RNA sequence: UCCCCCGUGCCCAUAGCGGCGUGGAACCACCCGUUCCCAUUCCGAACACGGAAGUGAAACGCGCCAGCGCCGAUGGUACUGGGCGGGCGACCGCCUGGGAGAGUAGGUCGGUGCGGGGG
RNA sequence: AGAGCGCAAGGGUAGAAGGGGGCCUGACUGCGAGGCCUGCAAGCCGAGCAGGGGCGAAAGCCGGGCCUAGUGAACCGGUGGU
RNA sequence: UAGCUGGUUCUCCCCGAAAUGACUUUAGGGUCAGCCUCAGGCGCUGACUGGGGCCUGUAGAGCACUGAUAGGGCUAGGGGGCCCACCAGCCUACCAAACCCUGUCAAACUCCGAAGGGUCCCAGGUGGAGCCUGGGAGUGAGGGCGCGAGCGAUAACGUCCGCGUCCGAGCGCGGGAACAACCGAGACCGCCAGCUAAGGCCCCCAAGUCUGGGCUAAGUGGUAAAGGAUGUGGCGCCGCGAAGACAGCCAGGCUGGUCGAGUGGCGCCGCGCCGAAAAUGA
């Protein structure tokens, strides 16, 4: 990675940007509220995807941990966090479509999926693809 | 311009500092007071800062 | 830490604005490098600061390209 | 190039836009900050013969004559992308002689 | 296919949404006009249409439309749609997003592999009788490791790809699992 | 008045990039030459002077295409002065006045001064 | 224009503030309309007048350096002068 | 000596702060500024507002720069296998620069860019407005709430700034059970008159056991989450069904009959259920 050590907490405003459309795979998983996801959580469901199903299709991850996440020790003031104990996280507002599955059937993802909800730290929805794009 | 008669109905206690001086500008003093004044853009402008104070009427 | 330094601030910006008044001299506008650019009866000075050439109104002329000029159209 | 342009204009007023072909040498003396030329003393494409530097020197005569009868004095001269030195030297040389 | 379009003015465009009418709009290089498609038929109309097969659209003026969907601004925070480009079509050629049917299972997908799909559809100029229900794609000697470009299209009389000449179609991707579970842990 | 050229300002890429075409009477360029004035960290490439003949190939001038670039609505939304509402909370919602960016439709191989030579 | 512009970062910038040359020392004296900035003290910009100069044919430009850091009231004392 | 603590006595009337900046062997002290007040000036200039120009780089957005980034492509470099030094050749579900595509992220990125804010002009604005010169001050511990950020742990009745506000000084009055700052409202005195505000109108407790339409059976309301469930009502879609479906019942391994009208699954809204253990009596 690069860029520079550690930076602002900012807030999570209105769900804006955060959100769109399925952009690969068939099935998605799209974020309701609002959060930090921390690596350790992407990468948690990652594997219990795949872990769920063998030699399966792909997932696409498409959040990803750019904020560095800060943290002092047990002490009191003085200075910045030390930081980065949770390392990194993705700021993720309400409708970001985190993973999504392809090559497979819509009941092994309507699992996988499912399953990785429950590993991330927030409420989650599932999705198809309708149609909804942008074309003519 | 006909006239507009504008009365104060709540108060300003707790609003912002300007809003005071719409009041003092279009010269409402106390509350649940008449007042009759000119259709001009100006008195409308601060009359329209204050509309959540007042009850306006066309005369 | 070893932050927590800093450099005081520098009031720099538009001084006169577009019509307005000026005096010969008035500080017109203090500036990091030609974010403006001088023009009629308009100087500058060593550290880019544009100043009125004679009395008169100020205005502020957009040029893309040749980039952004402020002058004083004189009158008495 | 052109920079010189730049520079006179600054000045203020009454530039002397020499310009010259290998054949040719025109000159106006062009009042700026309205975008209007005062007197157009070409030569070639106008009158005078073929020696270049003496028509150059000619030439200079020419916007001289031309320019009093209208009120003109400030030499103010756009020593253009040619260096002054010969043909455009001469020019404003001879707008000088008179 | 088929639907029932309307006028608009002056109605509120966020009051409408709450009776059920999706707002949108025809426009073409002569036309330009507010409507409101209805919601719940605009579903099942798009659903299958999308913006491959072109819609034509009636007015109370009986007008039938020969228009597709250029555009559709979804809403953030739950998908919904909230309003509707309408692109009024003539016959002079016009670009557009026409489908793909990949047809054939490749030697990757056979010793396990992937379907990777990069383009579910594709640019293309073409004129309005040319409503090419899709095209083909000979997707089965592909191999995981190998990919189709898009210089490999099964090209119908009259089309021309108004994309890049090279940008890729589909590609076949390697699975994924747990020969990379382990690998994954340790070594990073 | 009109048309082409030449010098020159104003608008600031809807002037531009690239491609086809064309103009040498005039005008301009390239061009002949390096004795004189003048010139290169070496060169008459550039500046400079004197100027047959040749040329419009390059350059530039005028046109014509929309591949790049550039310009780009409308509609809708985000956001949001001011005013409010729910809930236990990170937050969410309405009223009112303002309203983008991006994206579609689309446009675009310029507009125009003053002066000069030429039919 | 993503280089360069002595050095940090920034703003500026080739229609030069950047590279190279020829001549030169205005890294002047006497001043200073008028402003920026500001509690105070301080800091900053500055046309123009005079004197005598420098480069330029000239219009003109020069009161150090693209700019913004490179510093220290007052006392007491050192040196040179009218 | 005490830059500290304590104490400072009659009445009525008008106005009325501050808890900030700068410097300070300064940090609970001071000096100048800021805010209060008094006198003498000036006279529509004042806050606020309308129109008008200019100036700006946030929210938002965006990827053109600076960087970050997932997938794929094309593609130098590397590692591995065939082959051998006539060094090259070829492959490469290996890592991967640049590049392109799809998809994105950024306080110290911006091709863009709001509302808004600042200022000057013209206009309304005679106000316990405004300017000018002076006498006297106190203040220079603030706090809470709303909004925008930092710190913190997107903890704290935490902390540190910004705009605003109220308490401070309105612990005067109403509401909120009680309660500085939440809601209402700025208490000159009197009244056994009236209208209201917030909040309320079953009793304690003033005023509707008011009218109409729904929802809920938990005492929910009487204020806890991920998650769970044939709660309940309301809406939408898909599957088999009077050519006999689902449910069971008779026979065989879906088939048949008999019965005879609906049945199965998904999805969204309203109210609710579980998740739910604390110490004096609820
Ligand atoms: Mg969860
Ligand atoms: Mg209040
Ligand atoms: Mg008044
Ligand atoms: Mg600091
Ligand atoms: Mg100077
Ligand atoms: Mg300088
Ligand atoms: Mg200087
Ligand atoms: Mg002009
Ligand atoms: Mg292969
Ligand atoms: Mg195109
Ligand atoms: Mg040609
Ligand atoms: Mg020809
Ligand atoms: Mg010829
Ligand atoms: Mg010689
Ligand atoms: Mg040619
Ligand atoms: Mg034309
Ligand atoms: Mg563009
Ligand atoms: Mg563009
Ligand atoms: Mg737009
Ligand atoms: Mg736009
Ligand atoms: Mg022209
Ligand atoms: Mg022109
Ligand atoms: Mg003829
Ligand atoms: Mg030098
Ligand atoms: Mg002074
Ligand atoms: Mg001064
Ligand atoms: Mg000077
Ligand atoms: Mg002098
Ligand atoms: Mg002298
Ligand atoms: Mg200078
Ligand atoms: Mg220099
Ligand atoms: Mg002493
Ligand atoms: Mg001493
Ligand atoms: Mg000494
Ligand atoms: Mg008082
Ligand atoms: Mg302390
Ligand atoms: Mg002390
Ligand atoms: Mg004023
Ligand atoms: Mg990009
Ligand atoms: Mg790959
Ligand atoms: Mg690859
Ligand atoms: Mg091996
Ligand atoms: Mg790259
Ligand atoms: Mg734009
Ligand atoms: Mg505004
Ligand atoms: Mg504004
Ligand atoms: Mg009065
Ligand atoms: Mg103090
Ligand atoms: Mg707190
Ligand atoms: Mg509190
Ligand atoms: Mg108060
Ligand atoms: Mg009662
Ligand atoms: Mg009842
Ligand atoms: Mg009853
Ligand atoms: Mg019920
Ligand atoms: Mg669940
Ligand atoms: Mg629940
Ligand atoms: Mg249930
Ligand atoms: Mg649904």
Same mark, same amino acid.
């Given at each position: 990675?690069?860029?520079?050590?550690?930076?602002?907490?900012?807030?999570?405003?209105?769900?804006?940007?955060?959100?769109?459309?399925?952009?690969?795979?068939?099935?998605?998983?799209?974020?309701?509220?609002?959060?930090?996801?921390?690596?350790?959580?992407?990468?948690?469901?990652?594997?219990?995807?795949?872990?769920?199903?063998?030699?399966?299709?792909?997932?696409?991850?498409?959040?990803?941990?750019?904020?560095?996440?800060?943290?002092?020790?047990?002490?009191? #003031?003085?200075?910045?966090?030390?930081?980065?104990?949770?390392?990194?996280?993705?700021?993720?507002?309400?409708? #970001?479509?985190?993973?999504?599955?392809?090559?497979?059937?819509?009941?092994?993802?309507?699992?996988?999926?499912?399953?990785?909800?429950?590993?991330?730290?927030?409420?989650?929805?599932?999705?198809?693809?309708?149609?909804?794009?942008?074309?003519? | 311009?006909?006239?507009?008669?504008?009365?104060?109905?709540?108060?300003?206690?707790?609003?912002?500092?300007?809003?005071?001086?719409?009041?003092?500008?279009?010269?409402?003093?106390?509350?649940?007071?008449?007042?009759?004044?000119?259709?001009?853009?100006?008195? !409308?402008?601060?009359?329209?800062?204050?509309?959540?104070?007042? !009850?306006?009427?066309?005369? | 830490?070893?932050?927590?330094?800093?450099?005081?601030?520098?009031?720099?910006?538009?001084?006169?604005?577009? &019509?307005?008044?000026?005096?010969? &001299?008035?500080?017109?506008?203090?500036?990091?490098?030609?974010?403006?650019?001088?023009?009629?009866?308009?100087?500058? &000075?060593?550290?880019?600061?544009?100043?009125?050439?004679?009395?008169?109104?100020?205005?502020?002329?957009?040029?893309?390209?040749?980039?952004?000029?402020?002058?004083?159209?004189?009158?008495? | 190039?052109?920079?010189?342009?730049?520079?006179?204009?600054?000045?203020?007023?009454?530039?002397?836009?020499?310009?010259?072909?290998?054949?040719?040498?025109?000159?106006?003396?062009?009042?700026?900050?309205?975008?209007?030329?005062?007197?157009?003393?070409?030569?070639? +494409?106008?009158?005078?013969?073929?020696?270049?530097? %003496?028509? +150059?020197?000619?030439?200079?005569? +020419?916007?001289? %004559?031309?320019?009093?009868?209208?009120?003109?004095?400030?030499?103010?001269?756009?020593?253009?992308?040619?260096?002054?030195?010969?043909?455009?030297?001469?020019?404003?040389?001879?707008?000088? %002689?008179? | 296919?088929?639907?029932?379009?309307?006028?608009?003015?002056?109605?509120?465009?966020?009051?409408?949404?709450?009776?059920? =009418?999706?707002?949108?709009?025809?426009?073409?290089?002569?036309?330009?006009?507010?409507?409101?498609?209805?919601?719940?038929?605009? @579903?099942?109309?798009?659903?299958?249409?999308?913006?491959?097969?072109?819609?034509?659209? $009636?007015?109370?003026?009986?007008?039938?439309?020969?228009?597709? /969907?250029?555009?559709?601004?979804? @809403? =953030?925070?739950?998908?919904?749609?909230?309003?509707?480009?309408?692109?009024?079509?003539?016959?002079?050629? /016009?670009?557009?997003?026409?489908?793909?049917?990949?047809?054939?299972?490749?030697?990757?997908?056979?010793?396990?592999?992937?379907?990777?799909?990069?383009?579910?559809?594709?640019?293309? =100029?073409?004129?309005?009788?040319?409503?090419?229900?899709?095209?083909? /794609?000979?997707?089965?000697?592909? $191999?995981?490791?190998?990919?189709?470009?898009?210089?490999?299209? =099964?090209?119908?009389?009259?089309?021309?790809?108004? /994309?890049?000449?090279?940008?890729?179609?589909?590609?076949?991707?390697?699975?994924? @699992?747990?020969?990379?579970?382990?690998? $994954?842990?340790?070594?990073?």
């Amino acid at each position: 990675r690069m860029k520079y050590r550690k930076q602002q907490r900012g807030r999570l405003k209105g769900a804006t940007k955060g959100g769109d459309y399925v952009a690969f795979g068939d099935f998605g998983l799209v974020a309701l509220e609002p959060a930090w996801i921390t690596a350790q959580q992407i990468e948690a469901a990652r594997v219990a995807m795949v872990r769920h199903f063998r030699r399966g299709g792909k997932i696409f991850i498409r959040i990803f941990p750019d904020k560095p996440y800060t943290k002092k020790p047990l002490e009191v #003031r003085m200075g910045k966090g030390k930081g980065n104990v949770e390392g990194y996280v993705a700021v993720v507002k309400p409708g #970001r479509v985190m993973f999504e599955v392809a090559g497979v059937t819509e009941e092994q993802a309507m699992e996988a999926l499912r399953i990785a909800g429950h590993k991330l730290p927030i409420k989650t929805k599932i999705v198809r693809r309708d149609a909804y794009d942008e074309a003519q | 311009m006909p006239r507009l008669k504008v009365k104060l109905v709540k108060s300003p206690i707790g609003y912002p500092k300007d809003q005071k001086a719409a009041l003092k500008a279009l010269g409402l003093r106390r509350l649940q007071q008449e007042r009759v004044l000119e259709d001009t853009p100006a008195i !409308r402008g601060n009359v329209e800062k204050v509309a959540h104070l007042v !009850r306006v009427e066309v005369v | 830490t070893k932050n927590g330094r800093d450099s005081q601030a520098k009031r720099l910006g538009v001084k006169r604005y577009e &019509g307005q008044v000026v005096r010969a &001299g008035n500080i017109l506008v203090r500036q990091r490098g030609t974010r403006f650019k001088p023009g009629k009866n308009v100087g500058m &000075g060593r550290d880019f600061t544009l100043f009125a050439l004679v009395d008169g109104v100020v205005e502020f002329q957009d040029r893309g390209r040749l980039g952004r000029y402020v002058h004083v159209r004189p009158l008495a | 190039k052109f920079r010189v342009r730049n520079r006179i204009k600054r000045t203020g007023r009454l530039r002397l836009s020499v310009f010259r072909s290998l054949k040719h040498i025109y000159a106006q003396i062009i009042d700026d900050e309205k975008g209007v030329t005062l007197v157009s003393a070409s030569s070639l +494409a106008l009158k005078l013969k073929g020696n270049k530097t %003496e028509v +150059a020197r000619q030439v200079g005569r +020419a916007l001289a %004559e031309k320019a009093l009868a209208l009120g003109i004095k400030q030499v103010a001269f756009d020593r253009g992308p040619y260096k002054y030195h010969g043909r455009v030297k001469a020019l404003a040389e001879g707008a000088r %002689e008179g | 296919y088929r639907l029932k379009a309307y006028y608009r003015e002056g109605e509120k465009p966020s009051a409408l949404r709450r009776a059920g =009418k999706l707002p949108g709009v025809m426009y073409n290089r002569h036309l330009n006009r507010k409507v409101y498609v209805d919601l719940v038929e605009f @579903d099942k109309v798009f659903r299958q249409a999308s913006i491959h097969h072109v819609i034509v659209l $009636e007015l109370p003026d009986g007008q039938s439309l020969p228009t597709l /969907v250029r555009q559709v601004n979804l @809403d =953030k925070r739950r998908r919904r749609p909230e309003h509707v480009d309408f692109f009024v079509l003539s016959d002079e050629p /016009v670009e557009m997003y026409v489908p793909l049917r990949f047809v054939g299972t490749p030697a990757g997908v056979r010793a396990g592999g992937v379907l990777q799909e990069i383009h579910r559809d594709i640019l293309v =100029k073409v004129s309005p009788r040319n409503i090419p229900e899709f095209i083909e /794609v000979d997707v089965s000697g592909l $191999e995981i490791g190998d990919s189709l470009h898009a210089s490999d299209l =099964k090209l119908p009389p009259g089309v021309e790809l108004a /994309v890049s000449p090279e940008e890729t179609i589909a590609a076949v991707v390697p699975p994924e @699992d747990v020969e990379k579970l382990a690998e $994954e842990a340790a070594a990073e």
